[PDB]
Symmetry: C2
Subunit: 306 residues, 2 copies
Amino acid sequence: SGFRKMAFPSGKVEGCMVQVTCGTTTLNGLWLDDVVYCPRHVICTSEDMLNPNYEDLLIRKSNHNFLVQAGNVQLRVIGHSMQNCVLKLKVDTANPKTPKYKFVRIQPGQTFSVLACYNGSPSGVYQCAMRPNFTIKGSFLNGSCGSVGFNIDYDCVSFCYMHHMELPTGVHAGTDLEGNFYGPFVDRQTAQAAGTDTTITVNVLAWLYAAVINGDRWFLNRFTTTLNDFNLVAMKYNYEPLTQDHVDILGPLSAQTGIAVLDMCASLKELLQNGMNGRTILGSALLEDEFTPFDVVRQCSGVTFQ
Amino acid sequence: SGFRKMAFPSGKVEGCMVQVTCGTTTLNGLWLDDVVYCPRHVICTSEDMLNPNYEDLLIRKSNHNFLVQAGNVQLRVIGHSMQNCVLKLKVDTANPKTPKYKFVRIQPGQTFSVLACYNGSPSGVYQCAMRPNFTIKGSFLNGSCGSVGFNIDYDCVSFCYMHHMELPTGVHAGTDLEGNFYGPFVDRQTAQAAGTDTTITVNVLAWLYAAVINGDRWFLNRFTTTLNDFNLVAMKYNYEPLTQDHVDILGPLSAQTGIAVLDMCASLKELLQNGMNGRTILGSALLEDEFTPFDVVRQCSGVTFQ
């Protein structure tokens, strides 16, 4: 028993992190087979960042202008290209610690683990949600660029996020591993607006089931609502609307607890409208929205990797 | 920027996790050089656990009654001994993935990372504090016994915790790697009292510094106080006493932020007496006491390991 924000074990990712250097810019790369992936802004000086023409900047760079370092050793680049906002450096060596992997583009509300790195070395691992406005609320210092987010499926690492930018507002933006930004952001040092953020309703509901499973049940009540009823309240609290898809994904949790999805919704409706008084839930004074329904089942059923 | 509850990268510990089975009980073991370390209650049935005589139970066991599995590899057990509440199994093979390591006994209020494991396989990683009352508020299901807590120092793993039990209260208890319980606890399925559990004041102050560093400043007031005045308030709020040693450890954060420790103390006193008025600090509606001053400096400085 007990419920915590758990990250996936990071060992399989730690073996893929390298240091990439171009001029005097250094950040993190991801070495998979004979390719190193990193933020294309590795090619920019701080001044270039204000208004980069990446095609022009990259032309001034040859294979040999890229210094990729794997712990001790130093790899040889024999090919480079730019795919959207990522640079792909073909190297002369396949990574022998290359895990089974795929590249995935996640959806808002979905969670992942971030392995925060500096200079190609792992610092820390934490669990993040992609916000509805396609930012993440991470913890990233200068140098952390090219740090990656991932999920694990027994033995297969699904890479979903590469860190590219801190917005002037101090939240984080990045790309999938094909170099396509999540959200409206660009890799230029300019004021950029993230949308209005909203709370991930289906995640809060998941987390309330986790609370019941762990013996926190005070917020329960035998009130009802329709989906449409609930949403007309949720939207007044900047909650994402709940769809039937969301009801269907909560089905198993409903089944395990004997609390119908629409009842848990009635319970949340109450919590928003009436607040929490002084009481906590799973040790939290706010409603948590960074556990997906699948996160809760995994942690509550003890799913393992390898 | 940003601030998250971050664990150490787990890869070095992942390589040490094994499954240990004795009759119908399976749990996790830690394989370092040619020794596997696990909870001695691996020799117990659910029945035995009500009142075990570990000396008499272990008498009935030979080396071959212990099945140790590392991945798909069955290790051969060539010796067994009990040290306090851990069993040590001598095996014929040194773990080729043994990191540099120490065994350390941590103090209450210190933090570490737990690699939660089931059947010898890693499930997830999270950061924990040893509560003043020597419990941990973890996430441990049936079969997580033998999971370990650790800190990393560049390339050296400091193992500080092995999980043994859940108290009927739903909190967690275990040992150091020499098999000595933290707290008054025994490895028996019986009613067991934990102390009253107090807030780790020095960690709260650390976290207030982190908040200031991240621009969260609303709670800074225009009062000072004395250590004694502060402590008088602390005891009433179930907060641990603050000592000069604690003031000394906060010194660098004081230096970085320009806020004198005792000024931060007076701010904290005010939050305790007045509460937070529905406001948040670093995304929390409660005062967080799981970051040590070292954790805050480490995270705010981007300290890496291998």
